[model samples]
Target: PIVQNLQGQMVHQCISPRTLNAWVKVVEEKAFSPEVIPMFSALSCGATPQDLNTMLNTVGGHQAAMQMLKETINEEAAEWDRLHPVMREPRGSDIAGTTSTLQEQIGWMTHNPPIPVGEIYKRWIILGLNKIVRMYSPTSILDIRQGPKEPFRDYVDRFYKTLRAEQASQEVKNAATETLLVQNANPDCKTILKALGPGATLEEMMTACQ
Candidate 1:
């Protein structure tokens, strides 16, 4: 029962999962705003209705999100009953900010999970928008190469993205972060890391790297 792609066109296939974070950003930003259509179309790129729908059910709430797609296609402002629930905002200025939560700061804690479907839907939309095809970044940490011209900051970010996307024993991530970063670095990064020293977190590696 889907209509068109968010962009008003159609997409033929699936996009890369690596761009998930960027898409997540867009969805969260645009969800409650007046400026979603272009961002939607822009983000939709070429994904077909089904593609977005699949994302809706998977990432967004099965009920509200599917209805949201319906609303978008309608292009009306009448406001459907489906869009009724207000998002988490404030409880006498409580939740969004106001860090002092009755005692110690609870602000650092992430949103309680199985996260709300509304939030999940936002992630799906943006993820759909920033879609990529083919493969380069599906990973073992050792293979993500830093380009000579690529900034160490960005390479590090991308490396971390891949790392986060894959499943690893909790201990592996904690223990291997430095090893992967060093081994995966390009020649220049390797040399810089070398001159600087080894990279490890548990005892021996960290102090040596510094």
Candidate 2:
């Protein structure tokens, strides 16, 4: 279903100097047919229709064309980082835009080291390209801090909203939520989660904290 949705979005938005990811999007999600790939490669290289015929007619030319596009995209990304070193580490504020931006924060967090590449890729799968901007996980929930001026109810709401993405067993989720909520508690409510005791539902814990 998501593959269908993404392919549809790309066709609508195939339009993109194109970003490095612009071409990555064209090839990453799924395989394109042999004949059709030439169409995309030609576009990326600014080649005319005749170029496609050459790539198709020459032996093993299809593979060569695909390899050429990959190398081109990677080289452009490396050159971009070289030309604009500071461009790599983007900064953000409270109004930052999307889920990917949240992951961007994760990249620089943990006292400045990056989140692992493999970890980030797994999350990109979980979050996909929907960019709902609220794609949160239970483990990541601890990393989010309540703003000093934020409302308790609002913070708790965001807390539980993030918890929705977690897939642990009920007991495990409840237990971890209890522990993490206490650890994340504001000055006024540090003891409340444990005070509510083990049987309390997350709703009860949140209501008491709020």
Candidate 3:
């Protein structure tokens, strides 16, 4: 049986086989619209600002689809498990990094050219929202009342804090100058703003840090 809507009404009261087949076709088309291409791109490669904006819209529209799929899969599997009890799948853990397997590299290579800036931008927005939600969440070591005791904020905040602390701890006042050689596109601009800390004057931060 299909799940009821929030109003406690059986929205899909009767499920005919023909109607179900048509619904599946519509769902399949919706799942692979042109807009979804960039999200797939961003997931494989590093996304720029433009890539982020595109991903944001895709994420918003498709999140409901993902939730529905999850629920449907769970219900179907539960019924299956009742009839055929099975062992859990074996797990193999690996650290996250750029694609290591040849198959993954080939897949990304094949899909390279069509990746556009717009889709990637949407993904960036989605990532920002996800990071914001994670920031206020409690950690295993930190007390709820203390708030972010492990210093985990958004990715940007952590990067800024590390840079600032490193700058402060250097033996020489000109250590920041020497560190210029190591500078890459590594800083998160948003995090720097947040990690400026309370009452830190903008003028002072700009003048002293740069």
Candidate 4:
């Protein structure tokens, strides 16, 4: 289901230049069949039929771009095939392990030196403000202390109200309280992070702390 949704979205709305270039690069690295090259080329360019045919016939488009297009087609097709449950059922366990291993590999691939938790918190706050701005207006200038909104000034005021409401939510505060309590009480807190916990699990950390 996720694969289907992602593929549909990619085909229809994934028109960013970065995505197009990435698609072309992937296809170039791995040679693909010629028959489907034109389809990928059209998709990457969002080109009309006449424009597509004209471009495909050009030397750079045909000799170079065609191969990249073919590769993209094959890659998408291969991904679709791999995503099919029926095709993957026979190697379910292998697929599960491979998926976990791939995630771990990808995590390490981009990981930088660890930053302090306080620094991370400060960064996240800035990120949240920027996200609010982007959500309100894609092209608006972001103010570090101000959030953007619909009618500019009025919207900025609303944004701050919303941010404060989010910060003050009872649910959010309760979760934070519970987290701190658990961390303080549990010496082996790392292992119990995912467990059902102090409320019903082996030990109550808050009780031990008191």
Candidate 5:
């Protein structure tokens, strides 16, 4: 039988009681709409367009759809939080170990529900690398000067390795190497520095010291 209102507008079958109740609650809270709910869920879960479309098609109604989305988002957020690093020691000092841990954590974060928080992950890598470099770097320009008991060749090797490990520029390396040579104050060292001049390459410096 057809149902009609006083104004004579025909009324069709209404949503199920359960569905209506859920819709009312969502409307009161202003949390989600049937159309916008899937989009929000997709963004939170980092879902592909195909996956989102599939979910939208399969979920029976707005309430069920929102419940599924909420669960997926919560699970991924928990995983992301768990992977946050706690640096127990100085950076760069434990480069290999730290890098390994970082890579593992990033991989874990990228999967297992795949939360859409990649910007935070990228910042973590950048800051983690920076911390390592800053902590292990030389204290000052004078810090790399040869020790009284340190052999000239040994000093050059240590300085080069330290700079290389921290990924310092070629210009900084050459300048620091030149300073070390001058501070050593040996006639032979000075002669090499003068010949190599201001634009000396690391290879030339190593050969000169040898």
Candidate 6:
């Protein structure tokens, strides 16, 4: 039976060979319910659920329905690409914007046609979140370095925040912070850092330099 055959499948309906023959006869005599018209149209084209069955049922045909779905998917994908170009290329610090745009696209998919299902939707969410995380991440090693014009206290705070955001190891944070302070510090401060040596903690280095 079609029901038995489709036991593990994720389809909305099943039809046996006997039922299919009966359905064919009904279609020949134009005796099927209006709801069954789409099913008959879909089966006649040899398109299964693995093919374009959902689209066929929704639009009530084979080729026309498949074409409609193809067009809709392409159009939606194009709009998504426009709104979130990071899918094509890397983005700057726009984590919030990227997240918002993905949310909007997901909501659009809920109401619009060609709604993606199951693994497809799950994969999309995963990829979208990955992109958002990348957007929020530090772009380069220099991001943790102190700017020449910034205040010492402010630079230290930002340096620590960046290290924390990057999930840097304690050793890495200490090394990077010490290097940045030495390179950007005043003449007297540079002397202090140079005398402190690599063994000093970041706090001890900062205190000695101050």
lDDT of each: 0.43, 0.40, 0.33, 0.33, 0.43, 0.43
- What is the lDDT, from 0 to 100, of the residue 134 in candidate 1? 10
Q: 1-210, model 6: which lDDT tens digit per residue? A: 112134573223333455456554554454222324334444444222232333223333234434443454444445556776642231211211222243333333333352343224233323332233333444544645555566566766665555543432223446555677567665556677788777877678667755
lDDT per residue for candidate 3 within 1-210, as digits (tens), equals 122478874222232444334434443564533222333443424433222223233343446544543344344434434655541221110001111332332233234352222232333333333333233233311112212323222322333433333332213224343233113212442246346654544354444334
Candidate 6 to truth, TM: 0.31
Model 4 per-residue lDDT tens digits across residues 4-116: 24435311222255544554554445233221233343343432222222323332322534445334434443554477646112122222122223333223222354112
Write one digit per residue (lDDT tens) for candidate 5, span 1-210.
013568984332332445434434543453331222323332324322222233334444445434454444444444554565451321221221223343333343344463323333322333333334334455444456566556567777665555544453223445565566566545666677677787776577667767
In model 6, state the lDDT of residue 192. 76
Off by over 4 Å in 6: 1-131, 137-139, 143-150, 166-177
Q: Which 10-residue window in model 3 sums to the lowest lDDT?
A: 90-99
TM-score of each: 0.31, 0.30, 0.17, 0.16, 0.34, 0.31
N/CA/C clash count, model 6: 0
- Which of the numbered candidates is closest to the native, going by highest TM-score? 5
Q: Give the Cα error of residue 163 in candidate 3, in Å.
A: 20
What ordering of candidates by TM-score runs from best to worst? 5, 6, 1, 2, 3, 4
**Measured by TM-score, how close is model 5 to the native structure?**
0.34
- Span of ten consecutive residues with least summed lDDT in model 5: 89-98
Candidate 4, which ten residues in sequence have the lowest lDDT sum? 87-96
After the best TM-score superposition of candidate 6, give how far the Cα of residue 195 lies from its true spot, in angstroms: 1.6
Residue 196 CA error for candidate 6 (Å)?
A: 1.6
Error of 1 at 18 (Å): 28
Worst 10 residues of 1 by lDDT: 102-111
Query: What lDDT is obtained when candidate 2 is compared to the true structure?
Result: 0.40
Badly placed stretches (over 4 Å) of model 5 are: 1-119, 136-141, 147-151, 161-187
Q: What are the per-residue Cα lDDT tens digits for candidate 2 across 123-186?
A: 2222221122122233566676567677667776666555543421122356667667667767
TM-score of 1: 0.31
